[PDB]
């Protein structure tokens, strides 16, 4: 068989574990407690800013960028993830730096999202800076009666390769 | 501690002073004769300091004298004409000074003083750069000094006075100078990458003994001679590390991957080899056996002019001196230390506060799993709209945009507001006007603000979005025109009231039979009733009916509201059109299919162009001449085809956009007539508006046909069907461009049918 | 595909001022090798002007009668990033014949 | 002189070919994303670069033909100098003549073909 081999490192490590197992157990439990703390912290901060592209109220969105050159094709793949329930009133709003990117329609309604179909909703981003400047673009999907985004996404726009 | 340079007597050496190479010297300037060396450091700030370190402490610093002019390349050698005792040489930019550190003792550790006597000096005409010292020729018991110049010249002093001075042939930036005794040669590295050796007696007679073109210019050159078996000359460039023979060729070389700053081939171990140690600009020392790394250490600072010496009974202590002012004697750290978490029984995890915070955060998590006012006002007159927004809390990064429709054009789109104090109003004003021929699907427009709330959790602000929609008037797109008696098609709206004078419903257009002409030529006729109670809308274009029908119903509602009466209908009992509506769909889909064909043809044309272009590039890269074989003609033909196809695709895109707008108007009218033809409430009308009006622009991945077809198939699947066989056979939904529009039309007719029998829409 | 799925950096279609390159006569700086070497390094690694760099390197190599491996290696690098590989392998081989160096070996590699 | 001119033209044409490859890729991207205006712009740029490159191609081809003629003239000169001598005194000249070209000692070269 291909049963692995173990070197001096393994027996020294097992001897350390056999002689100092209690301290390892205690410190790993402390580290796990601190990790749960920090993960809950970051999860709550994300819920606050609503920066999760995956978040009752079922949705899933991710934005793909395609193309070099001053004009990029930005396609938002959006999807309703539910057994059988459509989502009527939703709308997408883009947040960009109006001095670097020229978005024609930075806000538009989305079609009735049928559960199970990936809707590609695309736009044409265009770099305006004569010098190569890469700035982030935010996308917020939100209801039409609410003001807090249902979910969000980020895209680091690549360099322009302009003229 | 492994691979660190563990600390010995260490110090900082002034107030933002600056040193260089040659500064750090390490010998017996005290002439004790016991072997223990003494550190000597002189900056070009002025201070010359000499130390006898012991393993911080006060009495370590022997002396800290200050000379007026800067100090370059302190050295320790037999620089006096008479005796064989070591003297200390200080080279100022335009000065040479030999000294003598004489230490007299008192009856206490700190009662001993040290006197430096000016043995002699030398005024330097040229500006000195660096120097070397050695027994030039075959002299013994003497240490002559060859100083360089910043402008190439090298001047030699025979330990007493100005012996001579010769210019270096062809040098601009002076490099490192050294003197080899086994060959009696001055070796330098000129600006033009040439390591050059000159025989001494050759320069004394003024040429090049030999040269070697290394790949770069060298930072240092250290001829080491404690081995009389096989002599070698070390040259440290700024990218490589050479060890050259005595004839002039590379004995070996190392291609360093870091940036060296200093090196010192110290005492060797094996037979023939020479241990050396080099200092990165990455704060490390490397210890090679002439090519092969034997050890490496993390230094605290960027080493400049390292040395190795016996300091207080410990042989081979490494003395480093940074250029900022640090200095440190050190010994290698050879202690592999267990990687293990520290046992600190005293330090415990505070479970109380941590559990409080975790309970708070987990409460937020398990809870979530179960500020600005905008207003728009349109002027009564290219109508000027004014949007006022007012905040309650202080807001930041506000962006206000306006979206009306494709045909309507705004004189201003985006407006950016920065931070605003609470209870502050902001007004913007833009102008909207029709630009084109076809009338927009609806006159309503939207205006959206995206702002941010700065919070403690996210000082940058959580982003929020709020919108308001204004309603534009017919006076922007229409005009009163002549009416016609008959048109291609017409519809009716039968209210349960009296026929109202069209002058009262539409006062802007000055009988009970009115005619309208939109900017674009198209005309609509509105006929009130005399015997019946129904209004008739007629035109040749099904699109044209929508705007006038919507406005008629809205004005009827408003007027009959002003009269205070509460019961009012717009029944339209009859036949939903479904046939002049399908022709627009078919026109749209024919344009879509034509576009796909044009694009798949453009693909082939582009492939041809690329192939011919690659052929031509191959003919270009080739040296030999050859007939073009009319490849350029094929390229021109293909280019013409590509341009023609590109123009065709552009025109098809424009036609498709016009057809899409007209189809949007038609489907608006059809949803209106379905919501009237049956007593549809606001919920089902909203469902229909969501299903039939999905997007305002076709794209090469999602179009109107597939989207409305999926929506209608689903609406019939979950609400209006009870047989599973049809649910799985006909009522399926996909998002790919169809090959025919028959399924969409079948589903629309079936929707109207199953609504007629008494069906009702839902969501779940 | 993602822009950084075939390279460590996102892919690209093609792979005041101290001195204006259009003002100096490279035929006169080529006579002075001490100036020519640093000037070529400037043109090549700072300004990234492969054509003027190659002009300077050609004039310099003809001034040295084709006897210094460094100018051969530099011309080979100019070629290699112009696209001409065989015309660069020629110079790298001719530089290896002059004097073996790790640089030329890695360049031929 | 012909050698130097050929080298200059080769470097220039290589630069333009790299531009054309980038343009081809850049042009393709516009077509994919259905941005017809920038696609037409890329193709106009490609047309102009192709015309410049064809002009340079004509120039380089004429220069290369002249250089090949000059090389054949040099070699025919060597062969006509050696051909004038019978037996071993022939071979020598040839060798010397080549060793007089690799060193550009044109006067000594002519002395080899003058007396031998």
Give Cα separations from D103 to B452, B595, D2 (angstroms): 78, 68, 18
Residue B233 β-bridge partners: B223, B244
Question: Cβ-count burial of C11 within 10 angstroms (0-12 exposed, 13-18 middle, 19+ buried)?
Answer: middle
Chain C residues touching A63 at Cβ < 8 A = none
**Helix (H) / strand (E) containing D104:** none
Question: Cβ-count burial of B23 within 10 angstroms (0-12 exposed, 13-18 middle, 19+ buried)?
Answer: buried
Residue B500 near residue B536 (C-beta atoms within 8 A): no
| Cα distance between residue B235 and residue B185, in whole Å | 15
Tokens of D59: 């120039």
Longest dimension (CA), chain B: 141
Q: What single DSSP character describes residue B703?
A: -
The strand ranges marked E within B346-406 are 372-378, 383-391, 396-403
What separation, in Å, do the N-terminal and C-terminal C-alpha atoms of chain A show?
A: 62
Tokens of B173: 């930036």
Chain C residues touching B245 at Cβ < 8 A = none
Distance from CA of B740 to the nearest CA of D (A): 24
Residue of A nearest to D31 (CA): A67
| Cα distance between residue B709 and residue B691, in whole Å | 9
Tokens of A85: 């329930």
**In 10 A of CB B127, how many CB atoms?**
12
- Using beta carbons and an 8 Å cutoff, which residues of A are at the interface with D? 66-73, 124, 161
The strand ranges marked E within B135-238 are 144-147, 154-157, 162-166, 178-180, 185-189, 194-199, 210-213, 218-224, 232-237
What separation, in Å, do the N-terminal and C-terminal C-alpha atoms of chain D show?
A: 29
Residue A92's nearest CA partner among B695, D77, B535, B11 is B695
- Phi (first) and psi of residue C29, to 5 degrees: -75, -20
Between chains, do A68 and D29 touch, taking CB under 8 Å as contact? yes
Residue A113 near residue A121 (C-beta atoms within 8 A): no
Between chains, do A56 and B368 touch, taking CB under 8 Å as contact? no
Say if strands B113-116 and B120-123 run parallel, antiparallel, or are unpaired. unpaired
Longest dimension (CA), chain D: 76
Distance of CA A48 to the CA centre of its chain: 15
CB crowding B133-167: b at 16 or more within 10 Å, else e: bbbbeeeeebbbbbbbbeebbbbbbebeeeeebbe
Residue D55 near residue D25 (C-beta atoms within 8 A): no
CA dihedral sign of residues B2, B5, B9, B12: negative
**Helix (H) / strand (E) containing C80:** helix C69-82
Residue B38 near residue B91 (C-beta atoms within 8 A): no
**In 10 A of CB B59, how many CB atoms?**
11
Neighbors of chain C with 3 or more C-beta pairs under 8 Å? A, B, D
Tokens of A33: 């407690």
Q: After which residues is chain A broken (C to N over 2.5 A)?
A: 55
CB crowding B377-396: b at 16 or more within 10 Å, else e: ebeeeebebebebebeeebe
Tokens of B576: 């939903």
Coil vs helix vs strand at C61: helix
Chain C residues touching B250 at Cβ < 8 A = 99
| Cα distance between residue B374 and residue B387, in whole Å | 7
Distance from CA of B212 to the nearest CA of A (A): 44
Domain residue ranges of chain B, discontinuous segments joined by + = 1-336, 371-477, 478-571, 572-764
Q: What is the Cβ-side half-sphere exposure of residue B145, based on CA atoms within 13 angstroms?
A: 28
Question: Cβ-count burial of D51 within 10 angstroms (0-12 exposed, 13-18 middle, 19+ buried)?
Answer: exposed
Residue B508 near residue B551 (C-beta atoms within 8 A): no
Q: What is the Cβ-side half-sphere exposure of residue C74, based on CA atoms within 13 angstroms?
A: 30
Tokens of A80: 């309703």
Q: Provide CB contacts within 8 A for B67, sequence distance 6+.
A: B46, B47, B48, B90, B92, B97
Between chains, do B192 and C33 touch, taking CB under 8 Å as contact? yes
Residue B128 near residue B91 (C-beta atoms within 8 A): yes
- Looking at the partner chain, which of D7, D14, D23 has a beta carbon nearest the beta carbon of C83? D14
Q: Provide CB contacts within 8 A for B654, sequence distance 6+.
A: none
Residue B385 β-bridge partners: B378, B430
| Cα distance between residue A25 and residue A17, in whole Å | 10
Residue B192 near residue B217 (C-beta atoms within 8 A): no
Judged by a CB distance cut-off of 8 A, whether residue D19 touches chain A is: no
Residue of A nearest to C14 (CA): A161
**In 10 A of CB B697, how many CB atoms?**
17
Cβ-based contacts under 8 A for chains B and C = 29
CA dihedral sign of residues B432, B437, B439, B440: negative
Residue B480 β-bridge partners: B516
Longest dimension (CA), chain C: 50
Residue D24's nearest CA partner among D39, D5, D2, D11 is D39
- Phi (first) and psi of residue B218, to 5 degrees: -90, 145
Judged by a CB distance cut-off of 8 A, whether residue D61 touches chain B is: yes
Give Cα separations from B201 to B136, B178, B209, B425 (angstroms): 9, 16, 11, 91
| Cα distance between residue B320 and residue B301, in whole Å | 9
63-82 in A: which are within 8 Å (CB) of C?
Answer: 68
Q: After which residues is chain B broken (C to N over 2.5 A)?
A: 55, 206, 370, 381, 510
Structure-determination approach: cryo-EM
Give Cα separations from A20 to B349, B654, C4 (angstroms): 19, 76, 45
DSSP string, chain A: -------HHHHHHHHHHHHSHHHHHHHHHHHHHHHHHHHHHHHHHHHHHT--S------EEEEEEE-SSSEEEEEEEEE--SSS--B-SEEEEEE--TTTB--S-SEEE---B-TT-EEEEEEEEEB--SS----EEEEEEEESS-SS-SEEEEEE-------
71-100 in A: which are within 8 Å (CB) of B?
Answer: 75, 84-86, 88-89, 93, 95, 98
Tokens of D42: 């890329």
| Cα distance between residue A78 and residue A151, in whole Å | 11
Find tokens 């223990």 and name the residue: B36
Residue B318 β-bridge partners: B308, B330
> Which of B151, B192, B218, B255 to probe by mutation at the C interface, max C CB count within 10 Å?
B192
Q: What is the Cβ-side half-sphere exposure of residue C33, based on CA atoms within 13 angstroms?
A: 19
Residue C13's nearest CA partner among B351, B613, A69, B591 is A69
Among left, alpha and beta (phi > 0; psi -120 to 50; other), residue B231 is beta
- Looking at the partner chain, which of B170, B171, B215 has a beta carbon nearest the beta carbon of C101? B215
Coil vs helix vs strand at B408: strand
118-137 in A: which are within 8 Å (CB) of B?
Answer: 118-122
What separation, in Å, do the N-terminal and C-terminal C-alpha atoms of chain C show?
A: 30
Distance from CA of C19 to the nearest CA of B (A): 19
- Looking at the partner chain, which of B613, B625, B649 has a beta carbon nearest the beta carbon of D36? B649
Residue A90's nearest CA partner among B467, B630, D102 is B467
468-487 in B: which are within 8 Å (CB) of A?
Answer: none
33-92 in C: which are within 8 Å (CB) of D?
Answer: 50-51, 54-55, 58, 78, 82-84, 87
Three-class DSSP labels, D39-69? HHHHHHHHHHHHHHHHHHHHHHHHHHHHHHH
Please, what is the Cα angle at B548 between B543 and B553, to 5 degrees? 125
Residue B547 near residue B674 (C-beta atoms within 8 A): no
Give Cα separations from B689 to B600, B655, D29 (angstroms): 34, 24, 36
Residue B555 near residue B506 (C-beta atoms within 8 A): yes
Residue B696 near residue B703 (C-beta atoms within 8 A): no
**Helix (H) / strand (E) containing B142:** none
Percentages (nearest 5) of helix, strand, coil residues in chain C: 60, 0, 40
Between chains, do B253 and C101 touch, taking CB under 8 Å as contact? yes
Give Cα separations from B118 to B79, B80, B90, B141, B266 (angstroms): 12, 11, 10, 21, 32
Distance from CA of A11 to the nearest CA of B (A): 15
Cβ-based contacts under 8 A for chains A and D = 24
Q: Provide CB contacts within 8 A for B168, sequence distance 6+.
A: B152, B153, B154, B174, B188, B190
Domain residue ranges of chain A, discontinuous segments joined by + = 1-55, 56-163
Give Cα separations from A56 to A59, A81, A83, A87, A114 (angstroms): 9, 10, 11, 11, 15
Tokens of B391: 């905040």
Distance from CA of A88 to the nearest CA of B (A): 6
**In 10 A of CB A45, how many CB atoms?**
14
- Looking at the partner chain, which of C33, C34, C70 has a beta carbon nearest the beta carbon of B215? C70
Residue B537 β-bridge partners: B491, B526
- Looking at the partner chain, which of D8, D14, D18 has a beta carbon nearest the beta carbon of C14? D18
Give Cα separations from B123 to A88, B23, B69, B162, B166 (angstroms): 93, 20, 12, 10, 17
Chain A residues touching D30 at Cβ < 8 A = 67, 69, 71
| Cα distance between residue C85 and residue C68, in whole Å | 21
Distance from CA of D112 to the nearest CA of C (A): 23
**In 10 A of CB B592, how many CB atoms?**
21
Distance of CA B65 to the CA centre of its chain: 52
Give Cα separations from D48 to A110, D52, D58 (angstroms): 43, 6, 16
Residue A71 near residue D30 (C-beta atoms within 8 A): yes
Residue of A nearest to C11 (CA): A68
Torsion of CA B37, B42, B48, B52, to 10 degrees: -20
Between chains, do C14 and D11 touch, taking CB under 8 Å as contact? no
Tokens of B193: 């990458």
Coil vs helix vs strand at B97: strand
- At what resolution in Å was this solved? 4.0
Tokens of B361: 């955060």
- Phi (first) and psi of residue D54, to 5 degrees: -70, -35
Residue B184 near residue B199 (C-beta atoms within 8 A): yes
Please, what is the Cα angle at B66 between B65 and B68, to 5 degrees? 155
Q: Provide CB contacts within 8 A for B370, sequence distance 6+.
A: A56
Q: What single DSSP character describes residue B39?
A: E
- Phi (first) and psi of residue B36, to 5 degrees: -65, 125
Residue B452's nearest CA partner among A122, A48, C105, C90 is A48
Judged by a CB distance cut-off of 8 A, whether residue A43 touches chain B is: yes
Tokens of A7: 């070197």
Q: Provide CB contacts within 8 A for B734, sequence distance 6+.
A: A117, B706, B710
Adjacency order of strands within the sheet including A90-95: A107-109, A90-95, A136-143, A151-156
Residue B584 near residue B662 (C-beta atoms within 8 A): yes
Chain D residues touching B649 at Cβ < 8 A = 34, 36
CA dihedral sign of residues D53, D54, D55, D58: positive
Tokens of B300: 């605290």
Coil vs helix vs strand at B546: helix
**In 10 A of CB B101, how many CB atoms?**
23
Judged by a CB distance cut-off of 8 A, whether residue D48 touches chain A is: no
Coil vs helix vs strand at B133: strand
- Looking at the partner chain, which of C34, C83, C103 has a beta carbon nearest the beta carbon of B215? C103
Say if strands B38-42 and B25-27 run parallel, antiparallel, or are unpaired. antiparallel
Residue B491's nearest CA partner among B520, B444, B442, B524 is B524
Chain A residues touching D32 at Cβ < 8 A = 66-67, 73
Length of chain C: 109
- Looking at the partner chain, which of B610, B617, B650 has a beta carbon nearest the beta carbon of D36? B650
- Phi (first) and psi of residue A15, to 5 degrees: -70, -40
| Cα distance between residue B676 and residue B671, in whole Å | 9
Question: Cβ-count burial of B348 within 10 angstroms (0-12 exposed, 13-18 middle, 19+ buried)?
Answer: exposed
- Looking at the partner chain, which of D13, D40, D54 has a beta carbon nearest the beta carbon of B632? D54
Adjacency order of strands within the sheet including A118-126: A60-66, A71-79, A118-126
Q: What is the Cβ-side half-sphere exposure of residue D58, based on CA atoms within 13 angstroms?
A: 6
Residue of C nearest to A156 (CA): C3
CB crowding B500-529: b at 16 or more within 10 Å, else e: bebeebbeebeeeebbbbbbeebbbbbbbb
Q: What single DSSP character describes residue B341?
A: -
Judged by a CB distance cut-off of 8 A, whether residue A65 touches chain B is: no
């Amino acid at each position: 068989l291909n049963v692995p081999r173990k070197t001096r490192l393994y027996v020294d490590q097992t001897l350390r574990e056999r002689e100092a197992g209690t301290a390892m157990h205690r410190t790993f439990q402390a580290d796990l407690y601190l990790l749960r703390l920090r993960a809950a912290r970051a999860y709550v901060q994300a819920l606050e800013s609503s920066l999760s592209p995956v978040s009752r109220e079922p949705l899933k969105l991710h934005a793909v960028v395609q193309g070099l050159g001053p004009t990029f094709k930005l396609t938002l793949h959006l999807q309703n993830t539910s057994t059988a329930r459509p989502i009527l009133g939703l709308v997408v709003c883009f947040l960009y730096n109006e001095v670097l990117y020229a978005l024609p329609r930075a806000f538009f309604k989305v079609p009735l999202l049928v559960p199970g179909l990936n809707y590609p909703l695309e736009t044409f981003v265009k770099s305006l800076s004569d010098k190569g400047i890469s700035d982030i673009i935010k996308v917020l999907v939100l209801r039409e009666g609410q003001s807090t985004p249902l979910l969000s996404a980020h895209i680091n726009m690549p360099m322009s390769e302009g003229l | 501690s492994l691979f660190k340079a563990r600390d010995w007597w260490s110090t900082v050496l002034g107030d933002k002073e600056e040193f260089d190479q040659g500064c750090l010297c390490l010998a017996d300037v005290d002439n004790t004769g016991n072997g223990q060396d003494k550190i000597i450091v002189g900056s070009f700030m002025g201070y010359l300091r000499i130390f006898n370190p012991h393993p911080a402490q006060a009495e370590d610093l022997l002396l800290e004298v200050h000379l007026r002019d800067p100090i370059l390349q302190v050295e320790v050698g037999k620089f006096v004409s008479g005796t064989e005792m070591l003297h200390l040489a200080v080279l100022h930019s335009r000065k040479l000074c030999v000294y003598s550190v004489s230490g007299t003792l008192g009856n206490v550790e700190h009662g001993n003083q040290y006197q430096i006597k000016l043995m002699y000096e030398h005024n330097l005409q040229r500006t000195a750069c660096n120097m070397t010292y050695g027994s030039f020729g075959g002299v013994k018991g003497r240490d002559l000094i060859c100083i360089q110049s910043v402008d190439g010249m090298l001047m030699v002093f025979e330990q007493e006075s100005y012996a001579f001075g010769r210019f270096l042939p062809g040098s601009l930036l002076p490099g490192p100078l050294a003197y080899s005794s086994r060959t009696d040669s001055f070796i330098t590295v000129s600006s033009c990458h040439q390591v050059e050796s000159y025989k001494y007696q050759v320069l004394a007679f003024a040429v090049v003994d030999w040269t070697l073109n290394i790949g770069e210019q060298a930072i240092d050159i250290c001829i080491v001679s404690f081995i009389q078996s096989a002599s070698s000359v070390f040259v440290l460039g700024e990218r490589n590390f050479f060890c050259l023979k005595d004839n002039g060729q590379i004995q070996f070389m190392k291609k360093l991957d870091y940036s060296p700053s200093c090196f010192l081939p110290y005492c060797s171990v094996s037979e023939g080899t020479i241990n050396t140690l080099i200092g990165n600009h990455n704060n490390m020392l490397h210890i090679y056996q002439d090519v092969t790394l034997k050890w490496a250490t993390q230094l605290p600072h960027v080493p400049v002019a390292v040395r190795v010496g016996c300091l207080h009974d410990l042989k081979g202590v490494i003395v480093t001196l940074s250029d900022d002012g640090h200095l440190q004697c050190s010994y290698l750290g050879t202690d592999p230390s267990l990687f293990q978490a520290p046992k600190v029984e005293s330090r415990e995890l505070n479970y109380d506060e941590l559990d409080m915070e975790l309970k708070e955060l987990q409460k937020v998590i398990k809870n979530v799993n179960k500020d600005l006012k905008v207003s728009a006002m349109v002027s009564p007159n290219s109508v000027t709209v004014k949007v006022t927004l007012k905040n309650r809390v202080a807001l930041q990064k506000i962006k206000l945009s306006i979206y009306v429709q494709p045909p309507l054009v705004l004189t201003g789109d985006q407006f950016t507001f920065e931070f605003m104090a609470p209870e502050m109003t902001r007004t913007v004003g833009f102008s909207v006007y029709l630009k084109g021929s076809y009338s927009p699907p609806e006159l309503e427009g939207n205006a959206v603000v995206s702002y941010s709330r700065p919070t403690e959790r996210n000082p940058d602000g959580i982003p929020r979005v709020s919108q308001c929609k204004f309603r534009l008037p017919l006076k922007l797109v229409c005009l009163p025109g002549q009416p016609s008696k008959t048109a291609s098609h017409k519809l009716t709206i039968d209210t349960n009231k009296s026929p109202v004078s069209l002058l009262s419903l539409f006062p802007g257009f000055a009988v009970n039979v009115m005619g309208f002409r939109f900017l674009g030529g198209s005309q609509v006729t509105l006929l009130a009733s005399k015997t019946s109670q129904r209004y008739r809308i007629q035109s040749e274009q099904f699109e044209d009916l929508w705007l006038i029908t919507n406005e008629l119903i809205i004005r009827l509602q408003e007027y009959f509201e002003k009269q205070g009466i509460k019961d009012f209908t717009c029944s339209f009992s009859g036949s939903v059109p479904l046939e002049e509506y399908f022709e627009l769909i078919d026109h749209h889909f024919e344009l879509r299919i034509n576009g796909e064909k044009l694009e798949e043809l453009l693909s082939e044309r582009a492939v041809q162009f690329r192939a011919i272009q690659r052929r031509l590039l191959t003919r270009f890269k080739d040296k030999t001449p050859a007939p073009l074989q009319h490849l350029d003609t094929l390229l021109d033909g293909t280019y013409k085809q590509v341009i023609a196809l590109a123009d065709a695709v552009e025109e098809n895109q424009d036609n498709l956009f016009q057809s899409f707008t007209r189809l949007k108007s038609a489907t608006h009218l059809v949803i209106l007539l379905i919501g009237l033809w049956q007593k549809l409430s606001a919920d089902q009308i909203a469902i229909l508006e969501a299903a039939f009006l999905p997007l305002q622009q076709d794209t090469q991945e999602l179009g109107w046909e597939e989207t409305v077809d999926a929506a209608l198939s689903h609406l019939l699947k979950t609400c209006l069907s009870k047989s599973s066989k049809e649910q799985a056979l006909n009522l399926n939904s996909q998002l790919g461009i169809p090959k025919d529009t028959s399924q969409l039309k079948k589903h629309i007719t079936l929707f109207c049918d199953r609504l007629a029998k008494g069906g009702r829409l839902c969501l779940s | 595909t993602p822009r950084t799925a075939y390279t460590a950096r996102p892919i690209a279609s093609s792979s005041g001022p101290f001195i204006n390159l259009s003002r100096l006569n490279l035929a006169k700086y080529a006579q002075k090798p001490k100036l020519a070497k640093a000037l070529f390094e400037y043109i090549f690694h700072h300004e990234n002007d492969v054509k003027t760099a190659l002009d300077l390197a050609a004039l310099s190599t003809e001034h040295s009668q084709y006897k210094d491996w460094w100018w051969k290696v530099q011309i080979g690098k100019c070629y290699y990033r112009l696209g001409l590989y065989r015309e660069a392998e020629k110079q790298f081989k001719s530089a290896l014949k002059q004097q073996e160096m790790v640089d030329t070996f890695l360049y031929l590699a | 002189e012909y050698h130097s001119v050929h080298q200059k033209l080769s470097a220039d044409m290589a630069d333009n070919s790299n531009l054309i490859r980038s343009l081809l890729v850049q042009a393709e991207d516009a077509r994919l994303m259905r941005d017809m205006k920038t696609m037409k712009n890329r193709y106009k740029e490609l047309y102009d670069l192709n015309k410049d490159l064809l002009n340079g191609y004509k120039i380089r081809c004429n220069n290369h033909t002249e250089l090949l003629g000059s090389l054949k003239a040099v070699n025919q000169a060597i062969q006509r100098a050696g051909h004038l001598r019978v037996g071993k005194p022939k071979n020598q000249v040839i060798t010397a003549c080549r060793d007089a070209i690799r060193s550009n000692n044109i006067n000594m070269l002519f002395r080899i073909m003058r007396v031998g």
